[PDB]
């Protein structure tokens, strides 16, 4: 079903230290697979997932070139961006760029996006129909009128509806082995006393993929957010993710509290409890 091809590009100017730094990271779903960094020992597009450790030199040279070229474009762009804002080379600035395509359950194009951000704030967005650009500012107007006039939407739309999709499929294929595997979370509940009156119940979800997951506590079979806490999902570092949910309970009421875990890799949602 659902799957996505996404890239995240960052360019950061260093004013008396040469050309700005340029990084590109590629994801298929929640799996990174390539990267380019013009500061790495090898300033080339390089594989970041096992199933790309084979790809011919041709793919790599192509991508190293594409990233390089963009670095240059972005170098010019950082200088232009500084004029729209009335900026000297005094400080360093960031141009961000993201784009991706998403397939619906049928394995076909469902949505594409692309945007630009300057110094962390939205600057230019491709519209939802991929036909034109919107200055998400009024200082980005020149950029909007210039890209709408030169008909630049069209090249991005081709990439996002075709190329990106085509390639999304090659990558799934190259990595079907692991990319389509749904690793369910190893769940368990731990007990951490706070005092004689209360203690913390912590419900653990570990080693799962994809990152999407839902942890909730219930008390006596009712939704329960009072004295609840949920951490952001984090990467285990091995490709999988982690997450935990916490609820403050009175001594001897623990068996009233059940944790529920929803994940795409579980045949059905799991219900947990502290075994004492």
């Amino acid at each position: 079903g659902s799957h996505s091809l996404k890239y995240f590009h960052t360019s950061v100017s260093r004013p008396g230290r040469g050309e700005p730094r340029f990084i590109s990271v590629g994801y298929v779903d929640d799996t990174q697979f390539v990267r380019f960094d013009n500061d790495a020992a090898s300033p080339r597009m390089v594989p970041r997932a096992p199933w790309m450790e084979q790809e011919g030199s041709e793919y790599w040279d192509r991508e190293t070139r594409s990233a390089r070229d963009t670095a240059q474009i972005f170098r010019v762009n950082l200088r232009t961006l500084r004029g729209y804002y009335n900026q000297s080379e005094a400080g360093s600035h960031t141009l961000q760029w993201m784009h991706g395509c998403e397939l619906g359950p049928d394995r076909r194009f469902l949505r594409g996006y692309e945007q630009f951000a300057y110094d962390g704030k939205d600057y230019l967005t491709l519209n939802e129909d991929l036909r034109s650009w919107t200055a998400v500012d009024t200082a980005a107007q020149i950029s909007e009128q210039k890209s709408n006039d030169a008909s630049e939407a069209e090249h991005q739309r081709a990439y996002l509806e075709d190329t990106c999709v085509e390639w999304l499929h090659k990558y799934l294929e190259k990595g079907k082995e692991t990319l389509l595997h749904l690793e369910p979370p190893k769940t368990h509940v731990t007990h951490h006393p706070i005092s004689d009156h209360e203690a913390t119940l912590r419900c653990w979800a570990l080693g799962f993929y994809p990152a999407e997951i839902t942890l909730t506590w219930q008390q006596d079979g009712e939704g329960h957010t009072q004295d609840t806490e949920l951490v952001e999902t984090r990467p285990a570092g091995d490709g999988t993710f982690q997450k935990w949910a916490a609820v403050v309970v009175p001594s001897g009421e623990e068996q009233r509290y059940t944790c529920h875990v929803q994940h795409e890799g579980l045949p059905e949602p799991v219900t947990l409890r502290w075994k004492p």
Binding site: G26, Y59, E63, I73, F116, L124, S143, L160, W167
Partner: peptide, 9 residues
């Protein structure tokens, strides 16, 4: 692959 053409702002 990544997008082949990056806008000049």
């Amino acid at each position: 692959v990544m997008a082949p053409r990056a806008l000049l702002l």
